[PDB]
Structure formats: structure tokens, C-alpha cells
Write a protein that binds this ligand. Structure first.
Ligand SMILES: [Mn+2]
Ligand SMILES: [Mn+2]
Lengths: 198, 198
């Protein structure tokens, strides 16, 4: 069975960038619901012993009756699990991934400007991702709980821009949430995922 | 130009079903943003005097370069405009539309149960609608700001299930928001839109 992972930090560790109350709802309610529904779909099937990353990457091979729930609930579990691991109370812009971002975008600010533009223009619910595509870095968005793995791209950083991720503190001000996020990126984790994928 | 319509009631008129703070953000920020961006797209173009119902029903005829903004921001203006008008602090379950709902679904409760199931299973951002389709009533969902007019169905009642519509009071408990909504439906306005469409 899939399990709700513990947060790597206290619920208030990301203040004042993400509020404690949002971390509690987001993890204990939203993410938990995706795990519950994913397990209800795969329990007693071949997919109960398939890796989450493999079923997301190969969603087209998931049996038709199960595919929407694996896409939505499996995507929810995969995306939130990644999200908690790429946040940290002490974000420092260090690691090979920063050199390779600078190499691709010229400056870290040019990278952040593209990421923020894509995150702020995403219409409805979804995610903004930094991915590795055949050894090259790209920023992409996905709707709802869709994940770039399904399109053959490995995610190493994601921002959740579902309104539940930011509404209690920021309400409509998604751009202020985006600005806050740079203060709490776990670049140690992003670099680990990059070095494994590149 | 398109204009942000005034609410037909005080911002606190729908308490304790929808909180005043949500009415303020939802109307004064979210709806206003759709009006601003729709006007930025259409002002000074050959669409600057076209009605919004006509453009949404005929998105294919909207020029490719303006279509996403008309769909998303035009949808946002159309949808929220309808929404404010079908809420009321003085809801009474009577009218031709209520009689015809009871005739079609058997009971009003069976209608509400279907509507609630569609509203609570809608994945991501969107709306739940009561529509007229060739003189018959149907419940349909749309994603984001899409509208059933594009598919040739006239909307007479909509529930906004974007998270901004309910997160401040209800957080993840979308079903409690759906329960609250029945207490504030303007069945007189719904009946007007029904008589005009059936
Ligand atoms: Mn989320
Ligand atoms: Mn809305």
C-alpha cells in the first residue's frame, strides 16, 4: 500500500512563506485523500506492486478502468510527495543544478523570471516544473495532477499552483506566493534529483 | 467595454453560507481580473462590440490569437456574472423550473443528489451547471471557465467549485460548500433564465 509520507520539517517550519494552517490542510487532508483514493483503485491488483514513478511514466499502459484514478490520485500522491521534499526551512542556492541553470538561462534571475511567468499564467489548477529532457533543463506546466514523467521528462522541482496551496495566506495573489517560494526551495534535494536524472 | 457588475446584495448578505471576505475577494479581485484581461484582448479589435454569449457559443469563430483569452477571461466574466445573479439571501424553492425539476428527477432531493455528486467529483477547477438542452434539463460540468454554451446548452444555474470560491470558510470540505449553496439559490432568477431558454 501507498502511504502518506511524514513532512521532513515541522508544520510551521516554512513560516512566513507558507502558513502552518495551509501545511496542515495540504498534507493531512489533500495529500492524504490522494493516497486513500489511489490505494482504493490499486488494492488487490497488479498495480499494488508497481512503483508510482513507473505507473505515472506509463499511464497509457495502466488498465483503462484504473487509468483516470491512477492519473489523478497517483499524480496527486507523486506530485505532493515531491513537493514536500523540495521545500526546506533553509534554502541556499547551491549545487551543480544551479551552474547548469545559469548555463541554460544565462542567470538564475532569467530562470526565475521564466518559471514565475509560467506559474502565474497557468490557468486553473496545476503545477509548474523544472524538468530534465534528454539531459537538458526545461520549464513546463501541467494541469491538475498531470506530471511530466508521462511525457518522458523527469521533474526535479515543482510548484503547486492549485489555489488550496496558497489561498489562506495569499488569496488571489499567486505572484506573491511565487516570490515567497524562492525563499524555501531545497536546492540540496533539487540537485540530488538532477544529478540522478541528467 | 465589459464592466464588473455590482452584486445585487450586500457582501455579507449570503452569510453564514458564503463568508463576506470570500464575496469581497471573489467579486472585487477574481471577477475584476477576468474583466480587465478580456477588455485588453477585445478593445480596439473587430470583436470590441460582439456580445460575450455569442463569442462563447462560437469560440471556433473567435480569431485563433484571441481565442484562449475569450475562452478563459470571457468565460470568467460570463460565468461569474451568472453566478452573482443566481444567488440570493431570500431563496424559495418554487417556480416552473422547480416543478419541471421534480417532474424530471422525481423529487428535488434526487436532483440535488445528482448535482452534488457531479460538483464533488469535479477534478481540478470548474463549474457544475443546470442546462437546457433541446427543451430538457441536464446537469453537466465544465473545467476552468468553460461554459456549456460552447456545446449548444443554455446554462440556467451554476455552482463555482474553483477552490477560491470556498477555501477561506470550508478549506478542503467542498461537500459542505455544496450543502450550504442550496440555502442561497435565487430560484426566481433560475426560473427567468429557464422560461427564456426552454
Ligand atoms: Mn496541492
Ligand atoms: Mn470563481
Amino acid at each position: 500500500a501507498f502511504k502518506l509520507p511524514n513532512l521532513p520539517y515541522a508544520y510551521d517550519a516554512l513560516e512566513p512563506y507558507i502558513d502552518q494552517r495551509t501545511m496542515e490542510f495540504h498534507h493531512d487532508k489533500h495529500h492524504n485523500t490522494y493516497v486513500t483514493k489511489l490505494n482504493a483503485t490499486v488494492e488487490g491488483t497488479e498495480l499494488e506492486h508497481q512503483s508510482l514513478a513507473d505507473m505515472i511514466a506509463n499511464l497509457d499502459k495502466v488498465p483503462e478502468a484504473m487509468r483516470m484514478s491512477v492519473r489523478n490520485n497517483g499524480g496527486g500522491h507523486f506530485n505532493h510527495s515531491l513537493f514536500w521534499e523540495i521545500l526546506s526551512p533553509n534554502s541556499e542556492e547551491k549545487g551543480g543544478v544551479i551552474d547548469d541553470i545559469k548555463a541554460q538561462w544565462g542567470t538564475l534571475d532569467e530562470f526565475k523570471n521564466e518559471f514565475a511567468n509560467k506559474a502565474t499564467t497557468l490557468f486553473g489548477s496545476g503545477w509548474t516544473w523544472l524538468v530534465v529532457n534528454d539531459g537538458k533543463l526545461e520549464i513546463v506546466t501541467t494541469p491538475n495532477q498531470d506530471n511530466p514523467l508521462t511525457e518522458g521528462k523527469t521533474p526535479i522541482l515543482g510548484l503547486d499552483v492549485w489555489e488550496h496551496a496558497y489561498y489562506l495566506k495569499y488569496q488571489n495573489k499567486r505572484p506573491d506566493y511565487m516570490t515567497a517560494f524562492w525563499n524555501i526551495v531545497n536546492w540540496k534535494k533539487v540537485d540530488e534529483l538532477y544529478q540522478a536524472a541528467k
